[PDB]
Design a protein around this nucleic acid. Structure first.
Ligand SMILES: [Mg+2]
Lengths: 1338, 413, 48, 67, 146
RNA sequence: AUACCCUCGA
């Protein structure tokens, strides 16, 4: 065994140790005799023998001496496999710099010499000298000299100045670094300079120097004086048929390097002139650079082809970018594929398998069984029987297939559900038969899809297939507890048609003694499928745990509902099946049955539902005909009216009265209203388009029109599509996004004109083009999500912490978006839950909330609860099994070893393909309550609230808040806390239209410095619209009026100076430009009076932005520290708003440029959490100021809005898991034990602080600040280098690991995947634990 | 008409501007016929009446109209020249003399669809078909299909396979005549006359004395191509559709090729369908077929595939095409001939040895790939200059010159 | 400069006027011209 | 009946040690080192091992004592 | 599956099915008129009735009785082909009149009989002759196994 | 039995 794969620089001595010879000849194989030549790229002396256990001459052919090397044949006789491990070396006449440590964005060789990459490139390209060992001379070691400059320096000095050129000079510089002295000097000079940029550069210098010192790495090794050569089979020449040979790019590059090296030696040995020698050295540097990588500087090309050569960097990068196609993809055996086909006679656990595919896949199993039964003696006979397809081979094939599950997956597997185990059944054909109910999970229709089939071999593999990924096990979606193996289109249609009702039908009225009599009457044809009848039933209810009570009851229902209830298992009431059985109702029924009865009865119920749905959709000859699309009669009248209106509006525009810009909006609004009215009329006609006779007088009933059934049942189609099918198509958008001024009046039944078809083509082309980019972005996003959240696996059971996130129902707006029940279902409680009256414990502790608990919480008036979240659970290297709540694919709590991180990433990324103001008006009646409001009462009781943080809530009678609204600054509210307000009332009468400035104090104000023409302007509007004064702009004012700002000095009614609480200075708010101060100076202004009034995306890109924690073009400016805010000096061009908190004055405040509008009013509480200027928030400021839980709530809500817009439901556990993975790193402020500023894992800092507490001193513990990293940045910054190297930027991370000397302990999922070990999660957890037991404990 | 290639947008430079249709595409490039996938909108098809300009641009036909009536004269107009003219839809009210009797007709002045008074319209469309491509023009009731399914149907109809017996569509767009004639798959009479003799292989036409020169009056021998492998491994055969003695004119269809039914385009076959869920067998998009459709052999197709062998100049010696394969079994040699090649018209199962090559003696003999079984219909032999012509090549050649000799013998007769 | 000042309008690549359709003849002639220019350079080197 | 992967995994509440010890038992059964505690009803080793887990006749302690 | 019509909003399948049902009904009517040894005048008047209904223009009476009209009948016995152009094709009412002319239900639907139980479906389904294709995506070339 | 290019399906 082994562990902890290391990475470091290759020493010339260790490079020699690796090699088995010195490659010296460029050519590979002689054209006359086809054996590799001496000292060539395939020489037998170096790389090994061509034929296993053979030599060059054949002197020794026996298989006995496997290590002896013959006398005439120096090529040691050994196995042919050895050509894969044996490498050689090339001795270069001069050293050449390594391309990776040169051209990486932070140049390691440049950083180690404190000289810019440009200067090093000048030296390497033989353009300028560099100075080595300055000695006692004016020249410095870092000084570069030109030809004339160097000649002058040599003439002036003569000696004591070693100046060189090329990579030889760089090598001479590197080995004279004296890393100890440089580290000491740079550490001494690190705190001397207070510049942030310089301190950052010297900190990076320190990091590199300490990495080199600790890692046992030598700086001179960066410039390789000797380079290896790949073993011949890893750079093979695959002979083309016809005697041609196909040479790999590696062979071409190696040949080029060898040729240039041989040229170098034989031109230095004859003392060629300096210019040509330096040109040859440059060529050798370029050739080695092209061998190592390409396109960085030179972009070398091949012969007679514009395609660049493939270097080793591109080889290790793999295909598909950096996603290793050989170490992660790894085409497998015992596999096949074919087109899929629906099999309606299949049970949920089994799938059809063609005879030939099954016979080919299970061939070794068939051979084994044939030999065991003795029917075949030699394997040749077994092959003859299996190829003859003798009748007895089908019996043994059936025996090997009986209990051997197989794996089926679609091409894009967006989640674990995309590959499930099926117990194959032999079928006659070439297509793979699929169960209809698993198509939804696979997202696989039968329009040409193909599926790959894989045969697990080991008993471990078969048991994992049967116990974890058998199709019956995964009924519920891992993304949300809602079922995924649910009736789809056709079976939903059948079940819906069965459970309908007709006003008058054959067989209506009589009573049936049992469901059996109902079936007997229906099959005999004496009763309609949907006829209102009476039937008594024997339902067994599971109301009490462990006690199944059966009761007999007579229910008024239909024949179809009674028939379908005969399928329902024995734990559910009949009332669950007495409705119309729409798709959502059926899905909820399956979900309820799973959580009540079990799993086996649930799969039986699902199979029975599918069978009956198919049977009764076949019995009902439902069909689509031209008469089914019922065009409403009023559509013609509505269209004519709208055409008359648009003609009138066009005439008005021609008159010039109406502007084109307003006419566009008017006509689009008119046409949208007409389209909505037409659609409403069509739906109202279609839905009730049934007139029936009930023993005389005619009556109406729900329609039996086929298209209406297909919509209402939810089987297939939507109202938006019937809007096109039977109503006007409505407005359509031009490619620029502007809605075309004329709509499509015709529907698909009437047929569109040519122009309308062309517009619909605009729309359809836009959508179809968007689809492919949506798929690509979703794939990239889910790949990044998986690679950032893979190491997270449940390890502990209960971490022990009591921190979590306060979860409350999402009530953004007037309606409840998500009830509290759905948010905390399957979660775990973090603290006590209390009644409306305290001291009464409802939910004690971390009890996993289930259906019973959510019903209990709904019965009580619990509104806000705190639950344990993965962002909590401070356990190290994993997550506790509580803080990650109930598993979603299973009904119970998660089990140790569940890779919830990968499940989270798959859950978030799977539905990506589905992606792309004055006053408050209370909705319903409820007791109004205030939250986070800080305002004093007005003179008359207006209660104007100037605080920016504040909201208005209308709590229900029970106590839960039914609706909440954001109350803005300066809002007058008729405070009636505890007094119920009727629905539609306007309790708060805010009307900002401006930035009002409240006046918390009263008295006769003293507007000091109000200059009419310099600071203010008594400009009155027309018709005496305002008796006020307009403040003069700072630049529009005079030279002296530019610096003068109006100030309303705080005085009382008699002239007494007043000041705001907390600060001695008065609340004399300045009046800036564009102000509205109506109150006369010296007039008593009431408390809260308005003094100064100043007038003021979505889809996959948005969720990607949130998961990368990006900064938009204009981020929202937020307050830094809570306290007394000030005014920003606009003269300097950037507003500086100093903050003076009452608890402690901190004068530090940044300057915000006035390029973006700032809506901040001075003289109020800063409220660090609050916002200073509008705009989309920058995830960071929220994290570093509001906290972690606040950032968690904001990010979760932001992602969930995007997902809920398309109606896809995803549990928040997954988003919180990804958030935990991103917040995994923290930066340190005052270390005492580490570097000043460093990005270290929070686990590392926590461990260091815990050890320091019980250690040398007590102050050794470090203080740190949490930092947020994007997924593409958090994934590349992992401690393991193998995980990052196979994600992205392989070169950068590999060079960083090389210089840093990183070690990778294979303790993640991808590490064990690439190295071929058992996964540290799932069933490999036991193996990993035993390995840890045997390793750590001796 | 593609946008990739040299000097063209690469799929990584797609964006949206190229992959969207614009009012300037009307009648020049088909809006609905484009491949769905990585290259969508980058590759398009010219409209039915599309025409390249003298300077290289695309042009479409239109009918010039005056204030009172619609003038018959028709002018080809490119994208730049459509700004001044207000173009009317191909369908409009007519007073039986060309005068648009409607009050507001659908038009577009500057790529802005709107209504206009007939007294200001300047150009009128030619055909409503001139907007969609040739492939899209073959979809009946295209006006009742959304553009997504229309695109899918055009691209799908593009991928059909010629069945054993072609059946003309019971409901078509009439454009099938045009596409069948314009393609070269159908033998079209180059000069009208009276058919002299007909058979499954050739058609001989007596050219009318009026449409002929002084001497050699009747000479038009139309050799029908029999079952021949296409680029997609499908059969290409033409069948006569004319008897003896019937007069034919210039441009008539004497033989219809693959997927044709007496001069019409017949890709698939029409069959009685029902739209009803049948026991969940047509669940998502599946189809359930009666055993009649296999018994009547409607959708069977002929696939022709070829397998090759080359006689390399091997270092030790040239490999020879000989039947004495070393270690060869008897029945397999019985299937073969003396020259080492399967007789034409032999049923071949998997693994059987079609051609025998001995390379120094190792065997490079061709055998059929696994799972491939069929009937040998033709064998071709090519021999390098200066090499011995084998017996099979001699037989093939003598058959060919016998055919040629009899053709000119009857032509002289 | 006039387009910057507001006079006139910027061109857009949407119009089929701003694009043009090649054919077999055009790029066949282009390839023939490429081969011809290579042969011409070789001949000028030789016939000097 | 069928392998009770629903109730057996609920008793142990881990579902992974279930697979591990079931594979242990199935390998013992294929090697013939023990007797099926449940009478065979013509099934292969994995399924019968799973039903032995379900019936509670075999456990980790019982398999270890048998080991 | 009827469920594929309402979601993929294309009604061309249904209209094509109705018109194909009309085509095959006309073909069967012509075939049974030819089998009854009807005179050329009756065949000519029936063809004119087919060709005078709604669109296009009747072209008959330019064809010789025994030769061309009988050849037309022998070619139409398998179904009278209608050519409906792209956007100027057959309206609904023309298809309805064709259906009522071919003695088929004007709605294009009638109640089918089940093939196993032999009992009539309660509601009438849509049946007609639709031009179905076979694409070059055969499972014979897709089935691979290793 | 290696790399590009083209086309096609989900
Ligand atoms: Mg599909």
């Amino acid at each position: 065994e082994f562990d902890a794969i290391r990475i470091g620089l290759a020493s010339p001595e260790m490079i020699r140790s690796w090699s088995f010879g010195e490659v010296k000849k460029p050519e590979t194989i002689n054209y006359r005799t086809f054996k590799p030549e001496r000292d060539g790229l395939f020489c037998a002396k170096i790389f090994g023998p061509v034929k296993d256990y053979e030599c060059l001459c054949g002197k020794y052919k026996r298989l006995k001496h496997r290590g002896v090397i013959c006398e005439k044949c120096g090529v040691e006789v050994a196995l042919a496999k050895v050509r894969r491990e044996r490498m050689g070396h090339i001795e270069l006449a001069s050293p050449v710099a390594h391309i990776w440590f040169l051209k990486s964005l932070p140049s390691r060789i440049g950083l180690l010499l404190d000289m810019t990459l440009r200067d090093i490139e000048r030296v390497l390209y033989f353009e300028s000298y560099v100075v080595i060992d300055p000695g006692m001379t004016t020249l410095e070691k870092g000084q570069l000299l030109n030809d004339e400059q160097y000649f002058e320096a040599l003439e002036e000095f003569g000696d004591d100045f070693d100046a060189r050129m090329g990579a030889e000079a760089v090598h001479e510089l590197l080995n004279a670094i004296d890393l100890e002295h440089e580290i000491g000097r740079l550490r001494e000079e690190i705190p001397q300079t207070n510049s942030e940029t310089k301190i950052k550069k010297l900190s990076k210098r320190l990091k590199l120097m300490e990495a080199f010192q600790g890692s046992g790495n030598k700086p001179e090794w960066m410039v390789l004086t000797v380079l290896p050569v790949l073993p011949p089979d890893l750079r093979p020449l695959v002979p083309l048929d016809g005697g041609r040979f196909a040479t790999s790019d590696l062979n071409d590059l190696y040949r080029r390097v060898i040729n240039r090296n041989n040229r170098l030696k034989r031109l230095l040995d004859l003392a060629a002139p300096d210019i040509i020698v330096r040109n040859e050295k440059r060529m050798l540097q370029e050739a080695v650079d092209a061998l190592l990588d390409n396109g960085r500087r030179g972009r070398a090309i091949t012969g007679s082809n514009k395609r660049p050569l493939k270097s080793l960097a591109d080889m290790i990068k793999g295909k598909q970018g950096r996603f290793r196609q050989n170490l992660l993809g790894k085409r497998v055996d015992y596999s096949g594929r074919s087109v899929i086909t629906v099999g309606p006679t299949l049970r949920l656990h089994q799938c059809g398998l063609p005879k030939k595919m099954a016979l080919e896949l299970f061939k070794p199993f068939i051979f084994g069984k044939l030999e065991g039964r003795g029917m075949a003696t030699t394997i040749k006979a077994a092959k003859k029987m299996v190829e003859r397809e003798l009748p007895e081979v089908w019996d043994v094939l059936a025996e090997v297939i009986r209990e051997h599950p197989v794996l089926l997956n679609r091409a894009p597997t967006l989640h674990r559900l995309g590959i499930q185990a099926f117990e194959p059944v032999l079928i006659e054909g070439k297509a793979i038969q699929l169960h209809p109910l698993v198509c939804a999970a696979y997202n696989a229709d039968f329009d040409g899809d193909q599926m790959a089939v894989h045969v697990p071999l080991t008993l471990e593999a078969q048991l994992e297939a049967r116990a974890l990924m058998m199709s019956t096990n995964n009924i519920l979606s891992p993304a949300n507890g809602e079922p995924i193996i649910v009736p789809s289109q056709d079976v939903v249609m059948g079940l819906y048609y069965m459970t309908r009702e007709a006003i008058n039908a054959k067989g209506e009225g009589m009573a049936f003694a049992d469901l059996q009599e109902v079936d007997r009457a229906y099959r005999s044809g004496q009763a309609s499928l949907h006829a209102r009848v009476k039937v008594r039933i024997n339902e067994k209810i599971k109301g009490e745990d462990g006690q199944l009570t059966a009761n007999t009851r007579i229910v008024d229902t239909t024949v179809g509902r009674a028939l379908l209830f005969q399928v329902v298992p024995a734990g559910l009431p009949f009332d669950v099946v007495n409705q119309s059985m729409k798709k959502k109702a059926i899905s909820k029924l399956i979900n309820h049955c799973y959580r009540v009865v079990g799993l086996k009865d649930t799969v039986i119920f699902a199979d029975q539902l599918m069978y009956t749905g198919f049977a009764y959709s076949t019995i009902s000859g439902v069909s689509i005909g031209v008469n089914d699309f019922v065009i409403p009669d009023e559509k013609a009248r509505i269209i004519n009216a709208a055409t008359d209106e648009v003609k009138e509006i066009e005439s008005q525009y021609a008159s010039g009265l109406v502007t084109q810009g307003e006419k566009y909006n008017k006509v689009i609004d008119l046409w949208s209203k007409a389209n909505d009215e037409v659609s409403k009329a069509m739906m109202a006609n279609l839905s009730k388009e049934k007139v029936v006779d009930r023993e005389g007088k005619e009556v109406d009933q729900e329609s039996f029109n086929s298209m209406y059934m297909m919509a209402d049942s939810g089987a297939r189609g939507s109202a938006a599509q019937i809007r096109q099918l039977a109503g006007m198509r409505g407005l359509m958008a031009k490619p620029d996004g502007s809605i075309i001024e004329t709509p499509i009046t015709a529907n698909f039944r009437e047929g569109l004109n040519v122009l309308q078809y062309f517009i619909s083509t605009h729309g359809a082309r836009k959508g179809l083009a968007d689809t492919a980019l949506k798929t690509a972005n979703s794939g990239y996003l889910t790949r990044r999500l998986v690679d950032v959240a893979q190491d997270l696996v449940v390890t502990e059971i209960d971490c022990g912490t009591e921190h979590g996130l306060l979860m409350s129902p999402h009530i953004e707006g007037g309606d409840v978006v998500e009830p509290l029940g759905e948010r905390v279902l399957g979660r775990v409680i973090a603290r006590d839950v209390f009644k409306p009256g305290s001291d009464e414990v409802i939910v004690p502790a971390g009890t996993l909330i289930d259906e019973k608990w959510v019903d209990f919480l709904e019965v009580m008036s619990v509104d806000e609860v705190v639950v344990r979240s993965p962002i909590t659970c401070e356990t190290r290297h994993g997550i506790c099994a509580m803080c990650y709540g109930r598993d979603l694919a299973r009904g119970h709590r998660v089990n140790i070893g569940e890779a919830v991180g990968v499940i989270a990433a798959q859950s978030i990324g799977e539905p990506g393909t589905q992606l792309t103001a004055d006053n408050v008006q209370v909705k319903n009646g409820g007791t109004i309550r205030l939250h986070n409001l800080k305002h004093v009462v007005r003179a008359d009781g207006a209660l104007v609230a100037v605080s920016r943080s504040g909201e208005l809530a209308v709590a229900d009678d029970f106590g839960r808040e039914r609706e909440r609204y954001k109350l803005p600054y300066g809002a007058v509210i008729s405070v009636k806390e505890g007094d119920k307000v009727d629905p539609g009332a306007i309790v708060a009468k805010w009307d900002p239209h401006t930035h009002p400035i409240v006046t918390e104090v009263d008295g006769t104000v003293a507007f000091v410095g109000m200059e009419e023409g310099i600071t203010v302007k008594r400009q009155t509007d027309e018709l005496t619209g305002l008796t006020n004064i307009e403040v003069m702009d700072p630049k529009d004012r005079p030279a002296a009026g530019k610096d003068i700002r109006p100030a309303v000095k705080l005085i009382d009614a008699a002239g007494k100076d007043l000041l705001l609480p907390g600060t001695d200075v008065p609340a004399q708010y300045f009046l800036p430009a564009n102000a509205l101060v109506n109150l006369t100076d010296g007039a008593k202004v009431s408390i809260g009076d308005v003094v100064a009034r100043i007038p003021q995306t979505g889809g996959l890109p948005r969720v990607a932005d949130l998961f990368e924690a990006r900064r938009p073009k204009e981020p929202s400016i937020l307050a830094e520290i809570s306290g007394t805010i000030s005014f920003g000096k606009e003269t300097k061009g950037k507003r500086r708003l100093v903050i003076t908190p009452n608890d402690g004055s901190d004068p530090y405040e940044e300057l915000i440029p006035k390029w973006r509008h700032l809506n901040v009013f001075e003289g109020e509480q800063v409220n660090r959490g609050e916002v200073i200027s509008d705009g989309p928030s920058n995830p960071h400021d929220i994290l570093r100021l509001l906290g972690v839980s606040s950032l968690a709530k904001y990010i979760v809500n932001e992602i969930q809005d995007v997902y809920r817009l398309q109606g896809v439901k995803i549990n928040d556990k997954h988003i919180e898991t990804i958030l935990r993975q991103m917040l995994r790193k923290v930066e340190v402020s005052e270390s005492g034990d580490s570097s000043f500023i460093k990005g270290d894992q929070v686990e590392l800092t926590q461990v260091l602080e815990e050890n320091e507490q019980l250690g040398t001193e007590d102050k050794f513990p470090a203080k740190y600040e949490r930092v947020l990293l994007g997924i593409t940045k958090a994934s590349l910054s992992t401690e393991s280098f193998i995980s990052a190297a196979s994600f992205q930027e392989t070169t950068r991370v590999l060079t960083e690991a090389a210089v840093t000397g990183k070690r990778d302990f294979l303790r993640g999922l991808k590490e064990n995947v690439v190295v071929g070990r058992l996964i540290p999660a799932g069933t490999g957890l036991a193996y990993h634990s035993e390995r840890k037991r045997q390793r750590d404990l001796g | 008409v593609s946008a990739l290639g040299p000097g063209g947008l690469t799929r990584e430079r797609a964006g949206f501007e190229v992959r969207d249709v614009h009012p300037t595409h009307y009648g020049r490039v088909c809006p609905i016929e484009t491949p769905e996938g990585p290259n969508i909108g980058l590759i398009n098809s010219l409209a039915t009446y599309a025409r390249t300009n003298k300077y290289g641009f695309l042009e479409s036909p239109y009918r010039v109209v005056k204030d009172s009536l619609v003038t018959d004269e028709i002018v080809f107009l490119s994208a730049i020249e459509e700004a001044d003219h207000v173009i009317a839809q191909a369908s409009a009210t007519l007073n039986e003399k060309g005068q648009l009797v409607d009050e507001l007709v659908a038009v577009r002045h500057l790529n802005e669809f709107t209504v206009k008074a007939p007294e200001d319209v300047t150009l009128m469309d030619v055909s409503p078909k001139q907007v969609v491509s040739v492939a899209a023009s073959l979809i009946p009731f295209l006006e009742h299909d959304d553009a997504n399914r229309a695109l899918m149907g055009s691209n799908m109809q593009r991928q059909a396979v010629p069945t054993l017996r072609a059946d003309k569509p019971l409901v078509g767009t009439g454009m099938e005549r045009n596409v069948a004639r314009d393609s070269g798959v159908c033998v079209v009479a180059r000069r009208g006359g009276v058919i002299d003799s007909v058979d499954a292989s050739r058609v001989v036409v007596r050219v009318a004395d009026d449409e002929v020169e002084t001497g050699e009056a009747g000479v038009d021998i139309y050799n029908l191509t029999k079952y021949t492998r296409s680029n997609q491994n499908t059969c290409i055969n033409q069948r006569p559709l004319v008897s003896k003695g019937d007069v034919v004119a210039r441009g008539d269809i004497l033989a219809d090729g693959p997927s044709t039914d007496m001069g019409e385009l017949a890709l698939g076959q029409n069959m009685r369908v029902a739209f009803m869920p049948w026991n969940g067998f047509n669940f998502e998009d599946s189809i359930c077929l009666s055993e009649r459709v296999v018994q009547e052999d409607r959708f069977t197709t002929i696939h022709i595939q070829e397998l090759t062998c080359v006689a390399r100049d091997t270092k030790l010696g040239p490999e020879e095409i000989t039947a004495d394969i070393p270690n060869v079994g008897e029945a397999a040699l019985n299937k073969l001939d003396e020259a080492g090649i399967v007789y034409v018209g032999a049923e071949v199962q998997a693994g059987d040895i079609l051609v025998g090559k001995v390379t120094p003696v190792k065997d490079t003999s061709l055998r059929v790939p696994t799972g491939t079984k069929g009937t040998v219909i033709d064998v071709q032999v090519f021999t390098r200059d200066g090499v011995e012509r084998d017996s099979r090549a001699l037989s093939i050649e003598k058959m060919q010159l016998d055919q040629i000799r009899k053709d000119l013998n009857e032509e002289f007769r | 400069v006039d387009i910057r000042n507001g006079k006139g309008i910027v061109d857009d690549i949407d119009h089929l006027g701003n694009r043009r359709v090649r054919c077999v003849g055009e790029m066949a002639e282009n390839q023939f011209r490429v081969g011809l220019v290579r042969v011409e350079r070789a001949v000028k080197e030789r016939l000097s | 009946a069928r392998v009770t992967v629903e109730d057996c995994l609920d008793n142990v509440d881990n579902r992974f040690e279930l697979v591990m010890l079931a594979t242990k038992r199935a390998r013992q059964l294929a090697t013939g080192g023990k007797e099926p505690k449940v009478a065979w009803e013509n099934d292969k080793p994995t399924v019968v091992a799973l039903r032995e887990i379900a019936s509670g006749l075999v456990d980790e302690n019982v398999v270890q004592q048998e080991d | 599956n009827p469920l594929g019509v309402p979601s993929r909003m294309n009604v061309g399948q249904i209209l094509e099915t109705h018109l194909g049902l009309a085509a095959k009904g006309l073909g069967e009517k012509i075939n049974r008129m030819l089998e009854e040894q009807r005179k050329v005048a009756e065949l000519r008047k029936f063809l004119h009735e087919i060709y005078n209904e709604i669109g296009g223009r009747e072209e008959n009476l330019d064809e010789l009785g025994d030769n061309e009209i009988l050849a037309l009948a022998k070619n139409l016995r398998g179904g009278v082909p209608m050519a409906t152009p792209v956007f100027d094709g057959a309206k609904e009412r023309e298809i309805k009149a064709m259906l009522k002319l071919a003695d088929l239900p004007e709605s294009g639907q009638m109640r089918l009989f089940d093939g196993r139980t032999g009992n009539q479906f309660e509601r009438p389904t849509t049946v007609g002759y639709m031009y179905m294709l076979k694409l070059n995506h055969l499972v014979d070339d897709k089935m691979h196994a290793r």
